[PDB]
């Protein structure tokens, strides 16, 4: 299928259900449809810069919007978690981070913060000609990675060059962001990784308030060490 009802649209977009008959479908891109925020929703319904899809098209056509440091002209480009959106005319830089409720929050960041992003290592494997590379959560293939980098680790990628500046190993005591489930958007420190081979691995996370919760590993994103996040949090 190719059409999406507003009632069937993802809940986290915040979109009012009665605005119209239909909602934007995110186009193919780095992020999954159910885990992406199209630039039309971001710019019109969150930023309020545009009033309908047509001003959104005009803005994107002016090349005033950059996603991860590159200009995007697609109305339904699927911006997602840890994506940097730059508006040079307004001198504004945003990072897409889920709030406690589980919705994208339009978090303003500084230029240095915009200069880099974080990607969770989805896959580490060697391509043709024996060249190691890493595939992150946003579909970035980065060659010649540091050997210590493994799956479930997080890599700090410089947007201008697309190279790994640093990395965080996945280990107990690391600071973690929940990217799925009922605990979506919560932040906490790892306590223990409950390994079920052939099944979904579970991680226990303790918040600053000492409350503990369990979540699947696929919804886990290391963002730094306890008390020293690598990103400005909302």
């Amino acid at each position: 299928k190719k059409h999406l009802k507003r009632l069937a649209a993802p809940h986290h977009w915040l979109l009012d259900k009665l605005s119209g008959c239909y909602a934007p479908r995110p186009s193919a891109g780095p992020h999954k449809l159910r885990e992406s925020l199209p630039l039309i929703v971001f710019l019109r319904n969150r930023l309020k810069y545009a009033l309908n899809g047509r001003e959104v098209k005009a803005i994107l056509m002016q090349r005033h919007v950059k996603v991860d440091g590159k200009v995007r002209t697609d109305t339904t480009y699927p911006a997602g978690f840890m994506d940097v959106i730059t508006l040079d005319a307004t001198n504004e830089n945003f990072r897409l981070v889920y709030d406690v409720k589980g919705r994208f929050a339009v978090h303003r960041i500084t230029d240095e913060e915009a200069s880099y992003k974080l990607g969770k290592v989805k896959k580490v494997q060697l391509g043709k000609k024996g060249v190691p590379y890493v595939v992150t959560h946003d579909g970035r293939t980065i060659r010649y990675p540091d050997p210590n980098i493994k799956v479930n680790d997080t890599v700090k990628i410089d947007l201008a060059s697309g190279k790994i500046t640093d990395f965080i190993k996945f280990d107990a005591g690391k600071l973690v962001y929940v990217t799925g489930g009922r605990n979506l958007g919560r932040i906490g420190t790892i306590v223990h990784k409950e390994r079920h081979d052939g099944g979904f691995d579970l991680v226990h996370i303790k918040d600053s308030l000492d409350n503990t919760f369990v979540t699947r590993l696929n919804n886990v994103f290391v963002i730094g060490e306890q008390g020293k996040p690598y990103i400005s949090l909302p």
Binding site: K101, G102, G180, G181, R182, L184, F200
Partner: peptide, 16 residues
């Protein structure tokens, strides 16, 4: 078996 699926009904307010 645990579904581990987010549901909209629980999150949305039922105060009315």
């Amino acid at each position: 078996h645990f579904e581990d699926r987010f549901d909209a009904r629980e999150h949305k307010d039922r105060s009315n």
